[PDB]
Ligand binder design. Structure first.
Ligand SMILES: *[C@@H]1O[C@H](CO[C@H]2O[C@@H](C)[C@@H](O)[C@@H](O)[C@@H]2O)[C@@H](O[C@@H]2O[C@H](CO)[C@@H](O[C@@H]3O[C@H](CO[C@@H]4O[C@H](CO)[C@@H](O)[C@H](O)[C@@H]4O)[C@@H](O)[C@H](O[C@@H]4O[C@H](CO)[C@@H](O)[C@H](O)[C@@H]4O)[C@@H]3O)[C@H](O)[C@H]2NC(C)=O)[C@H](O[C@@H]2O[C@@H](C)[C@@H](O)[C@@H](O)[C@@H]2O)[C@H]1NC(C)=O
Ligand SMILES: *[C@@H]1O[C@H](CO[C@@H]2O[C@@H](C)[C@@H](O)[C@@H](O)[C@@H]2O)[C@@H](O[C@@H]2O[C@H](CO)[C@@H](O[C@@H]3O[C@H](CO)[C@@H](O)[C@H](O)[C@@H]3O)[C@H](O)[C@H]2NC(C)=O)[C@H](O[C@@H]2O[C@@H](C)[C@@H](O)[C@@H](O)[C@@H]2O)[C@H]1NC(C)=O
Lengths: 166, 170
């Protein structure tokens, strides 16, 4: 099976995810952050999961934060809302871009002008078969319930955010 | 010194870098690929370089390919052309976005319809001083320099981005 895949993460102005934010996304307490993550692939049995998302004052995602949004696929922040996924098909190379979309309502946890939203994405299998990967599990099913995904099958992305300090 | 920084890589339609390209970028022989790579940061003394870029039939950037277009900052492919960089400054949170822009001409040397463009970005220092990073060097300077240790890392895991390409083929 073809498990070649690339991932992307982008912030958007609204929950129609029509227009990507230029240049650095500004946020304030009780404004929404709109997050689109995607995998581009050429195998229908191949899916992905948003393993973890969290914010911190550090671009390096190895640094610890207690501002967790998603953890082990389950939403940990109470404001996280999912939108429908969107699959864009490129039938000539039989490729598709599979997009997952969510938002959260920004909380005043930190006090730095710039913050970083870090999301870790991992590949999974949509169908018990010749694809060697954990089965895709929905966010709701994660919460009502933890295998190691190999480095080429996962990626962390980090987007910057600007905040006006009070 | 603040060496916090995030990177982006985006493909575009022309040398104007106006319209981002769809999720899979179509290529063909003798046609252009326009690439913009950016850093967002909060230190005027911090810069970045495009260390290496190559194309291959594998999404895994560990698998090397003989189709290398930039190596150790120097353009190895004669088609590579750099354009005016853009620098946007945001005074409220004291941040800046610096964009580097380049193009190459695709050559079709694989026999797969889906390819991947891999670029590795590294941080550098614009001024000798507090950043424990190598000095920034321009692509042309990197091509002419006989300084073997100009370029170094202390990182052991550094920043790579990969963009999918479809080779139109027919
Ligand atoms: C990521 O993608 C690459 C490219 O895959 C493409 O090609 C196939 C698989 C199809 O999915 C395409 O739509 C993709 O775009 C994977 O590498 C490829 O792996 C396949 C086997 O899984 C292997 O298959 C042989 O292909 C021969 C063609 O020769 C070359 O093709 C490449 C590919 O673009 C060119 O650049 C070359 O110039 C040259 O054309 C076929 O002749 C051969 O024929 C069949 O053999 C089978 C098996 O015996 C038999 O049943 C049939 O009847 C035929 O006789 C094979 O099918 C490709 O050669 C290989 N391509 C390259 C460029 O390496 C890659 O898979 C990973 O790496 C390869 C080397 C294997 O180790 C895979 O097991 C491994 O997964 C894939 N990566 C991942 C992680 O999925
Ligand atoms: C990445 O960002 C953080 C910068 O934090 C602040 O916000 C940004 C927007 C910018 O305005 C910076 O000017 C601000 O500092 C860094 O974390 C901060 O680091 C500073 C020290 O550089 C620390 O503040 C001071 O530390 C001095 C030491 O003289 C101490 O006497 C004071 O107590 C004073 O607080 C901040 O508290 C710290 N902020 C947080 C939220 O942790 C971060 O730098 C790195 O990690 C910190 C903890 C220190 O170890 C730094 O040495 C280390 O670089 C920045 N990361 C990088 C890679 O630059």
């Amino acid at each position: 099976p073809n498990s070649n895949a690339t991932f992307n993460m982008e912030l958007y102005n609204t929950d129609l995810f029509l227009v990507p934010s230029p240049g650095v996304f500004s946020v304030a307490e009780n404004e929404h952050v709109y997050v689109e993550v995607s995998v581009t692939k050429a195998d229908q049995d191949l899916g992905f999961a948003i393993q973890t998302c969290f914010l911190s004052p550090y671009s390096n995602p190895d640094r610890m934060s207690d501002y967790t949004i998603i953890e082990n696929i389950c939403p940990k922040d109470d404001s996280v809302k999912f939108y429908s996924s969107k699959r864009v098909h490129f039938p000539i190379p039989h490729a598709e871009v599979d997009k997952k979309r969510f938002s959260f309502l920004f909380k005043s946890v930190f006090n730095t002008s710039l913050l970083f939203l870090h999301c870790e994405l991992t590949l999974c299998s949509r169908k018990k078969g010749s694809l060697k990967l954990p089965r895709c599990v929905t966010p709701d099913d994660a919460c009502t319930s933890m295998i190691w995904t190999m480095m080429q099958n996962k990626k962390t992305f980090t987007k910057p955010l600007a905040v006006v300090l009070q």
